[PDB]
């Protein structure tokens, strides 16, 4: 029925049709074949307002895909600062590890987001957490040559 | 230029040939398009 | 056999010692400021 | 980009230090070739 019409409504960024589908009792926590929830879609693509309409409607803020990644992982990887904040303000695990042991700090530190790193650090991001290769967020920065993050 | 002449040596000449046209022929010449590297006897650093 | 060689080592030797090599130029482009010498570097040539 | 080319892992040293490509080279977008200097009224130029 509507758990499907919601994932695509959340991938498209269609606010009212999300709001209409939440009114139609569509599952906030529906997931596709790779485990991505409407919050996963809205965090990946950068839709703040649907992150706000889903979370206000009881969307699992710490949902993880079939590889262990969370909406904060996507939002911190891809620069959606406001969504990194809105996810974190609603109880997003700031130190969550995927099946590779990668944290939203690892992701944001890779691409050079300096703001999202600080927002994660404030919300208790483990500076010394490690991936499956022993690397931390610092090791990433000296690798990238980003003197600011270092 | 003679053989073995470098790219920087030919440039000063072209800059002089350039500079000539936009001053002593100011009324007539509109522009100079200078190429340092190929001439009509061949290609090399000593030609343009 | 008496020198412990095969046709493979012959072919590899001809392919290595009968070769023609692109070796660049002294004074090659882009050159350093104030370069005075530009000359073709001839490294290896086909045997004759 | 120049940065991704910069962090190419050439060699992990004995102590564990990484030899990155930016540790043995300058990296910049440039021309395929530098044999031709093209100037339009003494200024750098390209054209068709």
Curated annotation (Swiss-Prot), chain B:
Belongs to the resistance-nodulation-cell division (RND) (TC 2.A.6) family. Homotrimer, with large domains that extend into the periplasm, interacts with AcrA and TolC. AcrA may be required to stably link this protein and TolC. Interacts with AcrZ. Part of the AcrA-AcrB-AcrZ-TolC efflux pump. It comes from the Bacteria. Induction: Positively regulated by MarA, Rob and SoxS transcriptional regulators (at protein level). AcrA-AcrB-AcrZ-TolC is a drug efflux protein complex with broad substrate specificity that uses the proton motive force to export substrates. (Microbial infection) Involved in contact-dependent growth inhibition (CDI), acts downstream of BamA, the receptor for CDI. Its role in CDI is independent of the AcrA-AcrB-TolC efflux pump complex. This is Multidrug efflux pump subunit AcrB. It is found in: Cell inner membrane. The gene is acrB. Disruption phenotype: Loss of susceptibility to contact-dependent growth inhibition (CDI); inhibiting cells still contact the target.
UniProtKB/Swiss-Prot annotation, chain C:
It comes from the Bacteria. Induction: Positively regulated by MarA, Rob and SoxS transcriptional regulators (at protein level). Disruption phenotype: Loss of susceptibility to contact-dependent growth inhibition (CDI); inhibiting cells still contact the target. It is found in: Cell inner membrane. AcrA-AcrB-AcrZ-TolC is a drug efflux protein complex with broad substrate specificity that uses the proton motive force to export substrates. Belongs to the resistance-nodulation-cell division (RND) (TC 2.A.6) family. Homotrimer, with large domains that extend into the periplasm, interacts with AcrA and TolC. AcrA may be required to stably link this protein and TolC. Interacts with AcrZ. Part of the AcrA-AcrB-AcrZ-TolC efflux pump. This is Multidrug efflux pump subunit AcrB. It comes from Escherichia coli (strain K12). The lineage of its organism: Bacteria, Pseudomonadati, Pseudomonadota, Gammaproteobacteria, Enterobacterales.
């Amino acid at each position: 029925d509507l758990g499907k019409k919601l994932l695509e409504a959340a991938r498209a960024g269609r606010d009212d049709e999300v709001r209409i589908l939440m009114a139609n009792g569509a599952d906030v926590n529906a997931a596709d074949v790779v485990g991505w929830t409407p919050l996963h879609l809205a965090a990946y693509w950068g839709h703040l307002e649907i992150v706000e309409v889903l979370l206000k409607n009881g969307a699992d803020v710490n949902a993880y895909d079939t590889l262990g990644s969370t909406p904060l992982h996507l939002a911190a990887h891809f620069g959606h600062l406001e969504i990194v904040e809105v996810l974190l303000k609603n109880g997003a695990d700031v130190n969550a590890k995927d099946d590779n042991g990668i944290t939203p700090l690892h992701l944001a530190a890779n691409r050079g987001h300096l703001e999202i790193v600080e927002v994660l650090l404030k919300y208790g991001a483990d500076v010394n957490a490690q991936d499956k290769f022993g690397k931390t967020a610092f090791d990433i920065s000296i690798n990238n040559g980003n003197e600011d993050l270092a | 230029l003679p053989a073995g002449a470098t790219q920087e040596r030919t440039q000063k000449v072209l800059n002089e040939v350039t500079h000539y046209y936009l001053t002593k022929e100011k009324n007539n010449v509109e522009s100079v398009f200078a190429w340092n590297g190929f001439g009509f006897a061949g290609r090399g650093q000593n030609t343009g | 056999n008496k020198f412990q060689l095969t046709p493979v080592d012959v072919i590899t030797a001809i392919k290595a010692q009968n070769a023609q090599v692109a070796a660049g130029q002294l004074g090659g482009t882009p050159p350093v400021k104030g370069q005075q010498l530009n000359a073709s570097i001839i490294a290896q040539t086909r045997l004759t | 980009s120049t940065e991704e080319f910069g962090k190419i892992l050439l060699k992990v040293n004995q102590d564990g230090s990484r030899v990155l490509l930016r540790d043995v080279a300058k990296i910049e977008l440039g021309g395929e070739n530098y044999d031709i200097i093209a100037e339009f009224n003494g200024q750098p130029a390209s054209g068709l």
